[PDB]
C-alpha cells in the first residue's frame, strides 16, 4: 500500500540514488535486492535534479499532548460560530517539467476576498527542498476559463500569506480569539494551508495576554489578531469539513435548499460564502 502524499511528480524515468532518496520506495530499481538496497560503486549520485513533490494527501489526525487538534467537532465549531471563515481554493495543474499535482491559484474566503498566487510547488533537489515557481496550466475545462488570465496576475506566496493574515486579523479581532475555516471536501484547502499555516503548542501574544493566532518567521514571534501587523503565518487555526456531515450532492445543490441569495459566480470566494452559509443553516435551524 502507498499514499499520494509526497508523490514524486517529475518526468524522470529513473528513481533516486540510495543516498538521495527520501524513502526506500523512491530508490531506483537497480539498487533494490532482498527487501533492502545496495550501494553500487560506479553508479554516481545525480547533482542536478529538480523533482516536484506533491502536497496532496495530508492527514491531521495526530494525538500529541499540548498540541491542539486542527479539525474540530461540529459542537465545538457551533460554540465558535463567530470565528467561522468559509474557505475554498481553485487550483491549477503542474505541467511541463512535472505532472500529477495541483497548486493553489485562487484563494477564496467568505469575507468576499480572492487572492491570486503565483503557481508554486515544493521541488526536491540534491541539497534541499526549494519552494519555488513551477510551470502550471489552468484545469482543462470551460467552467474554469476565468482561471486562464489568473496565471499571469498572481503574487509571490511571501506576499499572499501576509495578505491572508491581514484579512483574517482585520475580520476577527473583535469577533473571536480563533479562526475556524469552514470547508467542503477539505483535501485541497488543507494542501493550500501548508503554504500559510504553522502549528505547535498554544502560545500567548508577545504584546498581550490573548492567545496567539499568528506567527512571524522573521522574528520568531507570536501575535493575537490585534498585534499581527507584518506577520506572515496563520498559527494554530481550526477547521471543519461540512461535506462530511452526511450531505449527498455537491456544495451548490445542498446550499440552494436553504438559501436563494448566493448565486454561483464560479469564483473561489463564492464557494467559500456558500460553504459558511450552508454550515449556518444546517447547524442553527
Amino acid at each position: 500500500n502507498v499514499t499520494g502524499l509526497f508523490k514524486d511528480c517529475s518526468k524522470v524515468i529513473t528513481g533516486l540514488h540510495p543516498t538521495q532518496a527520501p524513502t526506500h520506495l523512491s530508490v531506483d530499481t537497480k539498487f533494490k535486492t532482498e527487501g533492502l538496497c545496495v550501494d553500487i560503486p560506479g553508479i554516481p549520485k545525480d547533482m542536478t535534479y529538480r523533482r516536484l513533490i506533491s502536497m496532496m494527501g495530508f492527514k491531521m489526525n495526530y494525538q500529541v499532548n499540548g498540541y491542539p487538534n486542527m479539525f474540530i467537532t461540529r459542537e465545538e465549531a457551533i460554540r465558535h460560530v463567530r470565528a467561522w471563515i468559509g474557505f475554498d481554493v481553485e487550483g491549477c495543474h503542474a505541467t511541463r517539467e512535472a505532472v500529477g499535482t495541483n497548486l493553489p491559484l485562487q484563494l477564496g474566503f467568505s469575507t468576499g476576498v480572492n487572492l491570486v498566487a503565483v503557481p508554486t510547488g515544493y521541488v526536491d533537489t540534491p541539497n534541499n527542498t526549494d519552494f519555488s515557481r513551477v510551470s502550471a496550466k489552468p484545469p482543462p475545462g470551460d467552467q474554469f476559463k476565468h482561471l486562464i488570465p489568473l496565471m499571469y496576475k498572481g503574487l509571490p506566496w511571501n506576499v499572499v500569506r501576509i495578505k491572508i493574515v491581514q484579512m483574517l486579523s482585520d475580520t476577527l479581532k473583535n469577533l473571536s480569539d480563533r479562526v475556524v475555516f469552514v470547508l467542503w471536501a477539505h483535501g485541497f484547502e488543507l494542501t493550500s494551508m501548508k503554504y500559510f499555516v504553522k502549528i505547535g503548542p498554544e502560545r500567548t501574544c508577545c504584546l498581550c495576554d490573548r492567545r496567539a493566532t499568528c506567527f512571524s518567521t522573521a522574528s520568531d514571534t507570536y501575535a493575537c489578531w490585534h498585534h499581527s501587523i507584518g506577520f506572515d503565518y496563520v498559527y494554530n487555526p481550526f477547521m471543519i469539513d461540512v461535506q462530511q456531515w452526511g450531505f449527498t450532492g455537491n456544495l451548490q445543490s445542498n446550499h440552494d435548499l436553504y438559501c436563494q441569495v448566493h448565486g454561483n459566480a464560479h469564483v473561489a470566494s463564492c464557494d467559500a460564502i456558500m460553504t459558511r452559509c450552508l454550515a449556518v443553516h444546517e447547524c442553527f435551524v
Binding site: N1, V2, T3, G4, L5, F6, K7, D8, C9, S10, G15, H17, P18, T19, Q20, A21, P22, T23, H24, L25, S26, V27, T33, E34, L36, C37, V38, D39, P41, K45, I53, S54, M55, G57, F58, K59, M60, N61, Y62, Q63, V64, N65, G66, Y67, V99, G100, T101, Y122, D124, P126, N127, N128, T129, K194, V197, K198, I199, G200, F215, Y233
Partner: protein
C-alpha cells in the same frame, strides 16, 4: 501520473511535522506521546566490515551498526521542509549514515538527537573514543 514515495503508516507523523513551526520538537513530542517512528527508510544490505564512522560516502557499518541512505534519515528531507541552518543545506543527503543496531528502529530520531564527533567522526556516546 507520478510515482508514490510514501506509505500510509507515515502520513500522520509527516503531516504533523510538515506543518510545525519547530519540526524537530514536533517529532520528539510525537514519539514521547507514543507515536510510531518514521518507517520506509533506505536500509542498506552491506558487509558489516566497515570503519564504523557516522556519515560516509559509501556504507561503513560495523557488526554493531546498520547503514542507511542519509536523506531517508533526515526529518527535514522526509518532510520536504527547510533545513535549520542559514545556508539551508543538508549534511546527511548525498551520504550514508551508520546507526547503532539498538537504535535502528528510529533512524530519523537518532540523527535528530545525536551529534558526530568532529575529531574522530564517530557518534558521541556510540563509538566516540575521545574524552
Amino acid at each position: 501520473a507520478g510515482n508514490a514515495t510514501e506509505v500510509p503508516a507515515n502520513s500522520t507523523v509527516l503531516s504533523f511535522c510538515a506543518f510545525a513551526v519547530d519540526a524537530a520538537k514536533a517529532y520528539k513530542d510525537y514519539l514521547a506521546s507514543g507515536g510510531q517512528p518514521i518507517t520506509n527508510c533506505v536500509k542498506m544490505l552491506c558487509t558489516h566490515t566497515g570503519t564504523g564512522q557516522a556519515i560516509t560516502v559509501t556504507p561503513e557499518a560495523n557488526m554493531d551498526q546498520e547503514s542507511f541512505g542519509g536523506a531517508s534519515c533526515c526529518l527535514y528531507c522526509r518532510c520536504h521542509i527547510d533545513h535549520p541552518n542559514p545556508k539551508g543545506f543538508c549534511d546527511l543527503k548525498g551520504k550514508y549514515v551508520q546507526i547503532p543496531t539498538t537504535c535502528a528502529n528510529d533512524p530519523v530520531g537518532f540523527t535528530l538527537k545525536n551529534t558526530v564527533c568532529t575529531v574522530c567522526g564517530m557518534w558521541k556516546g556510540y563509538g566516540c573514543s575521545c574524552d
